[PDB]
Amino acid sequence: SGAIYVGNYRVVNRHLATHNDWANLVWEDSSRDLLVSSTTAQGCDTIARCDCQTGVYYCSSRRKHYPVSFSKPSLIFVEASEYYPARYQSHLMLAVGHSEPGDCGGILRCQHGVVGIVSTGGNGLVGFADVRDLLWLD
Ligand SMILES: CSc1ccc(Br)cc1CC(=O)N1C[C@H](C(N)=O)CC[C@@H]1C
Ligand SMILES: [Zn+2]
């Protein structure tokens, strides 16, 4: 679990969005596993606007932050799940690191701000949904 709070927006994994997120929908994209909903209170976070390929992510299944090197945002094949059929997930960045399904929503940050959130994983892999291209967030 986890979300980004910027301005009057809340950014979450689309597959974890609540009834309230859908009732206050701003934008969603199944191909990116992202959903943005509106909030009444002002948000705490800054979004990075950079091309960093190194950063730190929070891993809830270890209660720890880990440093990572990650690939540039791209179209990557993701196996069928309870939430989506087999498809290419876009704007996804992969890195070598530990992750489990419940780690989705953990923030990836660089020196400039929030880069994205955990969205996929594998055997010693972790994938992040990029948010740096969503200029309208701030
Ligand atoms: C951190 S997720 C993870 C981690 C390790 C392993 Br093995 C497997 C996973 C599961 C995973 O990749 N998922 C991503 C998928 C998607 N984004 O389309 C939705 C379902 C599920 C949460
Ligand atoms: Zn950066």
Rg of the chain on CA atoms, in Å: 14
For residue 11, give the nearest of 110, 111, 113, 85 by alpha carbon.
113
**Which residue among 15, 29, 59, 98 is the active-site one?**
15
Q: What is the rounded CA–CA span in Å between residue 105 and residue 117?
A: 5
Q: How far apart are CA 53 and CA 69, in angstroms?
A: 6
Burial class, 20, CB count within 10 angstroms (exposed 0-12 / middle 13-18 / buried 19+): exposed
**2 CB near ligand 1 (under 6 Å):** no
| Residue in 21, 91, 103, 104 annotated catalytic | 104
Strand ranges (E), the chain? 4-6, 9-13, 25-29, 34-38, 54-59, 64-69, 74-78, 87-96, 107-110, 113-122, 125-130
Amino acid in position 120: T
Ligand closest to the CA atom of residue 99: 1
**Way the structure was solved:** X-ray
Q: How many alpha carbons lie under 13 Å from residue 55 in its C-beta half-sphere? A: 30
Handedness of CA 67, 36, 21, 122 (dihedral sign): negative
- Sign of the Cα torsion 106, 119, 117, 110 reads positive
User: Does residue 44 carry a catalytic annotation?
Assistant: no
